[PDB]
Amino acid sequence: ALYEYQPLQIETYGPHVPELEMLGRLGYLNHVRAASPQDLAGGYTSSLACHRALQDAFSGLFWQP
């Protein structure tokens, strides 16, 4: 009875959102405000804001009541 990791499977009812670590490589971060050094010191990156914006954009897009 050993533990194996399993990702959370929550249905979003919308288009796939790119992974957080891939946002910079895919070019999304070129269109979001850069995190200030003070922001980065506390652990806040522009990737977080971009990822949340994309997730909210795609959440429930294909859902009908």
């Binding site: 895919l26 070129n30 269109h31 954009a57 959440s59 897009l61 294909f62 009541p65």
Partner: protein, 279 residues
């Protein structure tokens, strides 16, 4: 997140007929209570709807001039609270003048816009005694508003999905050379969509995408390829067809919206004042 939110599960309805049924039920229940308690004194459901539209406009104007400046999320949350409350309640039982202020108060608390009661009531255009009286009324109605919302306080607005779609368009849709030119008009359409029942009928992402595509069409720019390839809707034809139908229905909702008229609003306000003073 919207996809497992209380708004999606309990406050996104199947059709305008369901909303009309709920409002008619509320009006009928209040009429029955008044009949069993103690005529042209009663407001008709369409008259209630006209009054609700007028007082939602008043809530918008109240939030526009509010100091300190309200974030747009707070305003959207307050408007959602107003709509949801009057889905199941009659303006003859609870005056929308107090209810809209209570909605703004609760939205300020919920969306973490920290303001104190004195500065909240200083924004009301009244003498001091009026401000304290309004504050007491808001305090009395806060719990009732929370109860009538079924304790579902988190509201998902189309503003963040709109920004996310703008990011995605700037990243993956180079045909639209500068998506920022779509902003202003799209925002305009968003506001118009906010005046209808679409917020009770469609997801925030659908509303934001509809506003963006309406702005693009108004500018003579065609963007079906964004849906087809970028959003991968070529792998599911029925998904794309349903999304297009949803957008068309939302645009039709915007088209058939009729703003309240000043003379009718004055007559209905006199009727509502009479109904409240008679109770």
């Amino acid at each position: 997140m919207y996809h497992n939110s209380s708004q999606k599960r309990h406050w996104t309805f199947s059709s305008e007929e369901q909303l009309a049924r709920l409002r008619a039920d509320a009006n009928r229940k209040f009429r029955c209570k008044a009949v069993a308690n103690g005529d042209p004194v009663f407001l008709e459901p369409h008259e209630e709807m006209t009054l609700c539209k007028y007082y939602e406009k008043r809530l918008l104007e109240f939030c526009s001039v509010f100091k300190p400046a309200m974030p747009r999320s707070v305003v959207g949350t307050a408007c959602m609270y107003f709509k949801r409350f009057y889905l199941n309640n009659s303006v003859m039982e609870y005056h929308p003048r107090i209810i809209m202020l209570t909605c703004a108060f609760l939205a300020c608390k919920v969306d973490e816009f920290n303001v104190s009661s004195p500065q909240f009531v200083g924004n009301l255009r009244e003498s001091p005694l009026g401000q304290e009286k309004a504050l007491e009324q808001i305090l009395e109605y806060e719990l009732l508003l929370i109860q009538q919302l079924n304790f579902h306080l988190i509201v998902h607005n189309p503003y963040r999905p709109f920004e996310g779609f703008l990011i995605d368009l700037k990243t993956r849709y180079p045909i639209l050379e500068n998506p920022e030119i779509l902003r202003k008009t799209a925002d305009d359409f968003l506001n118009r969509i906010a005046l209808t029942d679409a917020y009770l009928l469609y997801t925030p992402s659908q509303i934001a995408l509809t506003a963006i595509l309406s702005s693009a069409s108004r500018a003579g720019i065609t963007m079906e390829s964004y849906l087809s390839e970028s959003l991968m809707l070529k792998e599911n034809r029925t998904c794309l067809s349903q999304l297009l139908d949803i957008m068309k229905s939302m645009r039709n909702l915007v088209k058939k919206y009729e703003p309240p008229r000043s003379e009718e609003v004055a007559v209905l306000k006199q009727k509502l004042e009479r109904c409240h003073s008679a109770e």
